[PDB]
Coordinates of N, CA, C and O and ligand atoms in Angstrom, one line a residue:
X1 N -14.0 12.5 -10.6 CA -15.0 11.3 -10.8 C -14.3 10.0 -10.2 O -13.3 10.1 -10.1
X2 N -15.1 9.0 -10.3 CA -14.6 7.6 -9.7 C -13.5 7.1 -10.6 O -12.5 6.7 -10.2
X3 N -13.8 7.0 -11.9 CA -12.7 6.6 -12.9 C -11.5 7.5 -12.9 O -10.3 7.1 -13.0
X4 N -11.8 8.8 -12.7 CA -10.8 9.7 -12.5 C -9.9 9.3 -11.3 O -8.7 9.3 -11.3
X5 N -10.5 9.2 -10.1 CA -9.8 8.8 -8.9 C -9.1 7.5 -9.2 O -8.0 7.4 -8.7
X6 N -9.8 6.6 -9.8 CA -9.1 5.2 -9.8 C -7.9 5.4 -10.8 O -6.8 4.9 -10.7
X7 N -7.9 6.3 -11.8 CA -6.8 6.5 -12.7 C -5.7 7.0 -12.0 O -4.6 6.6 -12.0
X8 N -5.9 7.9 -10.8 CA -4.8 8.3 -10.0 C -4.3 7.2 -9.2 O -3.0 7.1 -9.1
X9 N -5.1 6.4 -8.6 CA -4.8 5.4 -7.6 C -4.0 4.3 -8.2 O -3.1 3.8 -7.8
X10 N -4.3 4.0 -9.5 CA -3.7 2.7 -10.2 C -2.2 2.9 -10.2 O -1.6 1.7 -10.1
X11 N -1.7 4.0 -10.4 CA -0.4 4.1 -10.4 C 0.5 4.3 -9.2 O 1.7 4.0 -9.1
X12 N -0.2 4.6 -8.1 CA 0.4 4.8 -6.8 C 0.9 3.5 -6.2 O 2.0 3.5 -5.7
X13 N 0.0 2.5 -6.2 CA 0.4 1.2 -5.7 C 1.7 0.6 -6.0 O 2.6 0.2 -5.1
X14 N 2.1 0.6 -7.4 CA 3.3 0.0 -7.8 C 4.5 1.0 -7.4 O 5.5 0.4 -7.2
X15 N 4.4 2.3 -7.4 CA 5.4 3.2 -6.9 C 5.7 2.8 -5.4 O 6.9 2.9 -4.8
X16 N 4.6 2.5 -4.6 CA 4.8 2.2 -3.2 C 5.6 0.9 -3.1 O 6.6 0.7 -2.2
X17 N 5.1 -0.1 -3.8 CA 5.8 -1.5 -3.7 C 7.3 -1.4 -4.1 O 8.2 -1.9 -3.4
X18 N 7.6 -0.5 -5.1 CA 8.9 -0.4 -5.7 C 9.9 0.3 -4.5 O 11.0 -0.2 -4.3
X19 N 9.3 1.1 -3.6 CA 9.9 1.8 -2.4 C 10.3 0.7 -1.3 O 11.2 0.7 -0.8
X20 N 9.3 0.0 -0.9 CA 9.4 -1.1 0.0 C 10.5 -2.0 -0.5 O 11.3 -2.4 0.3
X21 N 10.7 -2.5 -1.8 CA 11.7 -3.2 -2.3 C 13.0 -2.5 -2.2 O 14.1 -3.2 -1.8
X22 N 13.0 -1.3 -2.5 CA 14.3 -0.4 -2.4 C 14.6 -0.2 -0.9 O 15.9 -0.4 -0.5
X23 N 13.6 -0.2 0.0 CA 13.9 -0.1 1.5 C 14.6 -1.5 1.9 O 15.7 -1.4 2.8
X24 N 14.2 -2.6 1.4 CA 14.8 -3.9 1.9 C 16.1 -4.1 1.3 O 17.1 -4.5 2.1
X25 N 16.4 -3.8 0.0 CA 17.8 -3.7 -0.6 C 18.7 -3.0 0.3 O 19.8 -3.4 0.6
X26 N 18.2 -1.6 0.5 CA 19.0 -0.9 1.3 C 19.4 -1.2 2.7 O 20.6 -1.3 3.0
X27 N 18.5 -1.7 3.4 CA 18.7 -2.4 4.7 C 19.7 -3.5 4.6 O 20.4 -3.7 5.5
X28 N 19.4 -4.5 3.7 CA 20.3 -5.6 3.8 C 21.7 -5.4 3.5 O 22.7 -5.8 3.7
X29 N 22.0 -4.0 2.8 CA 23.3 -3.6 2.4 C 23.9 -2.8 3.5 O 25.1 -2.2 3.5
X30 N 23.1 -2.4 4.7 CA 23.6 -1.3 5.7 C 23.4 0.0 5.5 O 23.9 0.7 6.4
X31 N 22.8 0.3 4.3 CA 22.7 1.8 4.1 C 21.5 2.4 4.9 O 20.4 2.7 4.3
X32 N 21.8 2.7 6.0 CA 20.7 3.1 7.0 C 20.1 4.5 6.7 O 18.8 4.8 6.9
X33 N 21.0 5.3 6.2 CA 20.5 6.7 5.7 C 19.5 6.4 4.7 O 18.4 7.2 4.7
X34 N 19.7 5.7 3.7 CA 18.8 5.5 2.5 C 17.5 4.8 3.0 O 16.4 5.2 2.5
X35 N 17.6 3.9 3.9 CA 16.4 3.3 4.4 C 15.6 4.4 5.1 O 14.2 4.4 4.8
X36 N 16.1 5.2 5.8 CA 15.2 6.2 6.5 C 14.6 7.2 5.5 O 13.4 7.7 5.7
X37 N 15.4 7.6 4.5 CA 14.9 8.3 3.4 C 13.7 7.8 2.8 O 12.7 8.4 2.7
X38 N 13.8 6.5 2.4 CA 12.7 5.8 1.8 C 11.5 5.6 2.7 O 10.4 5.7 2.3
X39 N 11.8 5.3 4.0 CA 10.6 5.3 4.8 C 9.9 6.6 4.9 O 8.7 6.6 5.1
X40 N 10.7 7.7 4.8 CA 10.1 9.1 4.9 C 9.2 9.3 3.6 O 8.2 9.8 3.6
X41 N 9.8 8.7 2.4 CA 8.9 9.0 1.1 C 7.9 8.1 1.3 O 6.7 8.5 0.7
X42 N 8.0 6.8 2.0 CA 6.8 6.0 1.9 C 5.6 6.5 2.8 O 4.3 6.4 2.6
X43 N 5.9 7.4 3.9 CA 4.9 8.0 4.7 C 4.0 8.8 3.9 O 2.8 8.6 4.2
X44 N 4.5 9.6 3.1 CA 3.7 10.5 2.2 C 3.0 9.8 1.2 O 1.7 10.0 1.2
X45 N 3.5 9.0 0.5 CA 2.7 8.3 -0.6 C 1.8 7.2 0.1 O 0.7 7.2 -0.5
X46 N 2.0 6.5 1.1 CA 1.0 5.7 1.8 C -0.2 6.5 2.2 O -1.3 6.0 2.1
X47 N 0.1 7.7 2.7 CA -1.0 8.5 3.2 C -1.9 8.8 2.1 O -3.2 8.8 2.0
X48 N -1.4 9.1 0.8 CA -1.9 9.5 -0.3 C -2.8 8.4 -0.8 O -4.0 8.5 -1.1
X49 N -2.2 7.1 -0.8 CA -2.9 5.9 -1.3 C -4.1 5.8 -0.4 O -5.4 5.6 -1.1
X50 N -4.1 5.8 0.7 CA -5.1 5.4 1.7 C -6.3 6.5 1.6 O -7.6 6.2 1.7
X51 N -5.9 7.9 1.5 CA -6.8 8.8 1.3 C -7.5 8.6 0.0 O -8.9 8.7 0.0
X52 N -7.0 8.2 -1.0 CA -7.8 8.0 -2.3 C -8.6 6.7 -2.3 O -9.7 6.7 -2.9
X53 N -8.0 5.7 -1.8 CA -8.9 4.4 -1.7 C -10.2 4.6 -0.9 O -11.3 4.2 -1.1
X54 N -10.0 5.5 0.4 CA -11.1 5.8 1.1 C -12.2 6.6 0.2 O -13.4 6.6 0.4
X55 N -11.6 7.7 -0.5 CA -12.5 8.3 -1.5 C -13.2 7.5 -2.5 O -14.4 7.7 -2.7
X56 N -12.5 6.6 -3.1 CA -13.2 5.8 -4.0 C -14.1 4.8 -3.4 O -15.4 4.7 -4.0
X57 N -14.1 4.4 -2.2 CA -14.9 3.7 -1.5 C -16.1 4.3 -1.3 O -17.4 3.8 -1.4
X58 N -16.0 5.7 -0.9 CA -17.1 6.4 -0.7 C -17.9 6.8 -1.7 O -19.3 6.6 -1.9
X59 N -17.3 6.9 -3.0 CA -18.0 7.3 -4.2 C -18.7 5.9 -4.7 O -19.6 6.0 -5.4
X60 N -18.0 4.8 -4.6 CA -18.6 3.6 -5.0 C -19.9 3.1 -4.3 O -20.9 2.7 -4.8
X61 N -19.8 3.6 -3.0 CA -21.0 3.4 -2.1 C -22.2 4.5 -2.6 O -23.3 4.0 -2.9
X62 N -21.8 5.7 -2.9 CA -22.9 6.6 -3.4 C -23.5 6.2 -4.7 O -24.6 6.3 -4.9
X63 N -22.7 5.4 -5.5 CA -23.3 4.8 -6.7 C -24.1 3.5 -6.6 O -24.6 3.0 -7.6
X64 N -24.0 3.0 -5.5 CA -24.8 1.7 -5.2 C -23.9 0.6 -6.1 O -24.7 -0.4 -6.6
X65 N -22.7 0.7 -6.3 CA -22.0 -0.3 -7.0 C -21.6 -1.5 -6.0 O -20.4 -1.2 -5.4
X66 N -22.4 -2.3 -5.8 CA -22.1 -3.5 -4.7 C -20.9 -4.2 -5.0 O -20.1 -4.4 -4.0
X67 N -20.4 -4.6 -6.2 CA -19.2 -5.3 -6.3 C -17.9 -4.3 -6.1 O -17.1 -4.8 -5.6
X68 N -17.9 -3.2 -6.5 CA -16.9 -2.3 -6.3 C -16.7 -2.1 -4.7 O -15.6 -1.9 -4.2
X69 N -17.9 -1.9 -4.1 CA -17.9 -1.5 -2.6 C -17.2 -2.8 -1.9 O -16.3 -2.6 -1.1
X70 N -17.6 -4.0 -2.3 CA -17.0 -5.1 -1.6 C -15.4 -5.2 -2.0 O -14.6 -5.6 -1.0
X71 N -15.0 -5.0 -3.2 CA -13.5 -5.0 -3.6 C -12.9 -3.8 -2.7 O -11.7 -4.2 -2.3
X72 N -13.5 -2.8 -2.9 CA -12.7 -1.6 -2.2 C -12.6 -1.9 -0.6 O -11.7 -1.5 0.0
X73 N -13.8 -2.6 -0.1 CA -13.6 -2.9 1.4 C -12.5 -3.9 1.6 O -11.7 -3.6 2.6
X74 N -12.2 -4.8 0.8 CA -11.0 -5.7 1.0 C -9.8 -4.9 0.9 O -8.7 -5.2 1.6
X75 N -9.7 -4.1 -0.2 CA -8.6 -3.2 -0.4 C -8.3 -2.4 0.9 O -7.2 -2.4 1.3
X76 N -9.3 -1.6 1.4 CA -9.0 -1.0 2.5 C -8.6 -1.7 3.9 O -7.8 -1.2 4.6
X77 N -9.1 -2.9 3.9 CA -8.8 -3.7 5.0 C -7.3 -4.1 5.0 O -6.7 -4.2 6.1
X78 N -6.9 -4.5 3.8 CA -5.5 -4.9 3.6 C -4.6 -3.6 3.7 O -3.5 -3.8 4.5
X79 N -5.0 -2.5 3.4 CA -4.3 -1.3 3.6 C -4.0 -1.0 5.0 O -2.9 -0.6 5.3
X80 N -5.2 -1.2 5.7 CA -5.1 -0.8 7.2 C -4.2 -1.8 7.9 O -3.3 -1.3 8.8
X81 N -4.1 -3.0 7.3 CA -2.9 -4.0 8.0 C -1.8 -3.4 7.6 O -0.8 -3.4 8.6
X82 N -1.3 -3.2 6.3 CA 0.0 -2.6 6.1 C 0.3 -1.3 6.8 O 1.5 -1.2 7.2
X83 N -0.7 -0.6 7.1 CA -0.4 0.8 7.8 C 0.0 0.5 9.1 O 0.9 1.2 9.7
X84 N -0.5 -0.6 9.8 CA -0.1 -1.0 11.2 C 1.3 -1.7 11.1 O 2.1 -1.3 12.2
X85 N 1.6 -2.5 10.2 CA 3.0 -3.0 10.0 C 3.8 -1.9 9.8 O 5.0 -2.0 10.3
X86 N 3.6 -1.0 8.9 CA 4.4 0.1 8.8 C 4.9 0.9 10.0 O 6.0 1.2 10.3
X87 N 3.8 1.4 10.7 CA 4.0 2.0 12.0 C 5.1 1.0 12.9 O 5.9 1.6 13.4
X88 N 4.8 -0.2 12.8 CA 5.5 -1.1 13.7 C 7.0 -1.1 13.2 O 7.8 -1.3 14.0
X89 N 7.2 -0.9 12.0 CA 8.4 -1.1 11.2 C 9.2 0.0 11.5 O 10.5 0.0 11.7
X90 N 8.7 1.3 11.4 CA 9.3 2.5 11.7 C 10.0 2.5 13.2 O 11.1 2.9 13.5
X91 N 9.0 2.0 14.0 CA 9.3 1.9 15.3 C 10.4 1.0 15.7 O 11.4 1.3 16.3
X92 N 10.4 -0.2 15.1 CA 11.6 -1.2 15.1 C 12.7 -0.6 14.4 O 13.9 -0.8 15.0
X93 N 12.7 0.1 13.3 CA 14.0 0.6 12.7 C 14.6 1.6 13.6 O 15.8 1.7 13.7
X94 N 13.8 2.5 14.3 CA 14.3 3.7 15.1 C 15.0 3.0 16.4 O 15.8 3.5 17.0
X95 N 14.3 1.8 16.8 CA 14.9 1.0 18.0 C 16.2 0.3 17.7 O 16.7 -0.3 18.5
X96 N 16.5 0.3 16.4 CA 17.6 -0.6 16.0 C 17.4 -2.1 16.1 O 18.4 -2.8 16.0
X97 N 16.2 -2.6 16.1 CA 15.9 -3.9 16.1 C 15.7 -4.5 14.7 O 14.8 -4.4 14.0
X98 N 17.0 -5.1 14.3 CA 17.0 -5.6 12.8 C 16.1 -6.8 12.6 O 15.5 -7.0 11.5
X99 N 15.8 -7.6 13.6 CA 15.1 -8.8 13.3 C 13.6 -8.4 13.1 O 13.1 -9.0 12.1
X100 N 13.1 -7.4 14.1 CA 11.8 -7.1 13.9 C 11.5 -6.3 12.6 O 10.6 -6.4 11.8
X101 N 12.5 -5.4 12.1 CA 12.5 -4.7 11.0 C 12.5 -5.4 9.7 O 11.7 -5.4 8.8
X102 N 13.5 -6.5 9.7 CA 13.5 -7.4 8.4 C 12.3 -8.2 8.4 O 11.7 -8.4 7.4
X103 N 11.8 -8.7 9.5 CA 10.5 -9.5 9.4 C 9.4 -8.7 9.0 O 8.6 -9.1 8.2
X104 N 9.2 -7.4 9.4 CA 8.2 -6.6 9.0 C 8.2 -6.1 7.6 O 7.2 -6.1 6.9
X105 N 9.4 -5.9 7.0 CA 9.5 -5.7 5.5 C 9.0 -6.7 4.8 O 8.3 -6.3 3.8
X106 N 9.5 -7.9 5.0 CA 9.3 -9.1 4.3 C 7.7 -9.2 4.3 O 7.1 -9.4 3.3
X107 N 7.0 -9.1 5.5 CA 5.6 -9.2 5.6 C 4.9 -8.1 4.8 O 3.9 -8.4 4.2
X108 N 5.4 -6.9 4.9 CA 4.7 -5.8 4.1 C 4.7 -6.0 2.8 O 3.8 -5.8 2.2
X109 N 5.8 -6.5 2.2 CA 5.9 -6.6 0.7 C 5.1 -7.6 0.3 O 4.6 -7.6 -0.7
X110 N 4.9 -8.8 1.1 CA 4.1 -9.9 0.8 C 2.8 -9.5 0.7 O 2.0 -9.8 -0.2
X111 N 2.2 -8.6 1.7 CA 0.9 -8.1 1.5 C 0.7 -7.1 0.4 O -0.2 -7.2 -0.3
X112 N 1.7 -6.4 0.1 CA 1.6 -5.3 -0.9 C 1.5 -6.1 -2.4 O 0.8 -5.7 -3.3
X113 N 2.4 -7.0 -2.5 CA 2.3 -7.9 -3.8 C 0.8 -8.3 -4.1 O 0.4 -8.4 -5.2
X114 N 0.1 -8.7 -3.0 CA -1.1 -9.4 -3.1 C -2.2 -8.3 -3.7 O -3.4 -8.8 -3.9
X115 N -1.9 -7.1 -3.4 CA -3.0 -6.1 -3.6 C -3.0 -5.8 -5.3 O -4.2 -5.4 -5.6
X116 N -2.1 -6.2 -6.0 CA -2.1 -5.8 -7.5 C -3.2 -6.5 -8.3 O -4.1 -5.8 -8.9
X117 N -3.5 -7.8 -8.0 CA -4.7 -8.5 -8.6 C -6.0 -7.8 -8.2 O -7.0 -7.8 -8.9
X118 N -6.1 -7.3 -6.9 CA -7.3 -6.8 -6.3 C -7.7 -5.4 -7.0 O -8.7 -5.1 -7.3
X119 N -6.5 -4.6 -7.2 CA -6.7 -3.3 -7.9 C -7.1 -3.6 -9.4 O -8.0 -2.9 -9.8
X120 N -6.7 -4.7 -10.0 CA -7.0 -5.1 -11.3 C -8.7 -5.4 -11.2 O -9.3 -5.0 -12.2
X121 N -9.0 -6.1 -10.3 CA -10.5 -6.3 -10.2 C -11.2 -5.1 -10.0 O -12.3 -5.0 -10.6
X122 N -10.8 -4.3 -9.1 CA -11.5 -2.9 -8.9 C -11.6 -2.1 -10.2 O -12.8 -1.6 -10.5
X123 N -10.7 -2.3 -11.0 CA -10.9 -1.6 -12.4 C -11.9 -2.0 -13.1 O -12.7 -1.3 -13.9
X124 N -12.2 -3.3 -13.3 CA -13.3 -4.0 -13.9 C -14.5 -3.7 -13.2 O -15.6 -3.6 -14.0
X125 N -14.6 -3.4 -12.0 CA -15.8 -3.4 -11.2 C -16.4 -2.1 -11.3 O -17.6 -1.9 -10.9
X126 N -15.6 -0.9 -11.4 CA -16.2 0.5 -11.4 C -16.7 0.8 -12.7 O -17.7 1.7 -12.6
Ligands
LIG201 O1 1.6 -0.8 0.6 N1 2.0 -1.5 -0.5 O2 2.8 -2.3 -0.5 C1 0.8 -1.4 -1.7 C2 1.2 -2.4 -2.6 C3 0.2 -2.4 -3.7 C4 -0.8 -1.5 -3.6 N2 -1.8 -1.3 -4.6 N3 -2.5 -0.1 -4.2 N4 -1.9 0.4 -3.0 C5 -0.8 -0.4 -2.6 C6 0.0 -0.4 -1.5
LIG202 O1 -7.1 -10.4 -3.3 N1 -7.4 -10.3 -4.5 O2 -6.4 -10.3 -5.3 C1 -8.7 -10.4 -5.2 C2 -8.9 -10.3 -6.5 C3 -10.3 -10.6 -6.9 C4 -11.3 -10.8 -6.0 N2 -12.7 -11.0 -6.0 N3 -13.2 -11.3 -4.8 N4 -12.4 -10.9 -4.0 C5 -11.1 -11.0 -4.5 C6 -9.7 -10.7 -4.1
LIG203 O1 -16.5 -6.7 -13.4 N1 -16.7 -6.9 -12.2 O2 -17.7 -6.3 -11.7 C1 -16.1 -7.8 -11.5 C2 -16.6 -8.2 -10.1 C3 -16.0 -9.1 -9.3 C4 -14.6 -9.6 -9.6 N2 -13.8 -10.2 -9.1 N3 -12.6 -10.4 -9.8 N4 -12.7 -9.7 -10.9 C5 -14.1 -9.0 -11.0 C6 -14.8 -8.2 -11.8
LIG204 C1 -18.9 -10.7 -5.8 AS1 -16.9 -11.2 -5.5 C2 -16.8 -10.4 -3.7 O1 -16.9 -12.6 -5.7 O2 -16.2 -10.1 -6.6
LIG205 ZN1 -24.9 10.7 -1.2
LIG206 ZN1 -12.7 -11.4 -2.0
LIG207 ZN1 -11.6 -9.6 -12.5
LIG208 ZN1 -14.1 -11.1 -7.5

């Protein structure tokens, strides 16, 4: 059910954000092994997050819950942006482009931080 799905979703976002912060700490220290591991952990979690968000959006539409549909639409649009910067960042990390990678990590984290209040609103709205 929707609250069931949201209950699963609620805990994913902060685990993802913790990994991005861990990736930036590792990168700034030169620990390139660990950055790669973290990026690989993030691929699987971020895929789960997006699958769950899309599932919640579809269920909120089925229920005719206008304001959850709108909040989930914002969430999905922001996640799609992070997804593209993530793809860009892995490509930059593999190319050895430190300027591109550091810039994208910073931007990704800034986007992720902004999702926590939106998840809070989604909880109220469902
Ligand atoms: O990718 N992220 O950085 C990130 C941050 C917060 C989130 N909340 N829900 N999913 C999330 C993903
Ligand atoms: O981005 N937000 O954190 C956030 C929170 C509550 C909202 N209500 N409407 N748009 C919203 C966006
Ligand atoms: O309870 N709500 O349905 C609801 C709707 C829009 C919101 N924006 N921020 N928090 C919100 C809660
Ligand atoms: C109805 As609204 C998009 O201000 O939460
Ligand atoms: Zn239907
Ligand atoms: Zn809004
Ligand atoms: Zn609210
Ligand atoms: Zn609102």
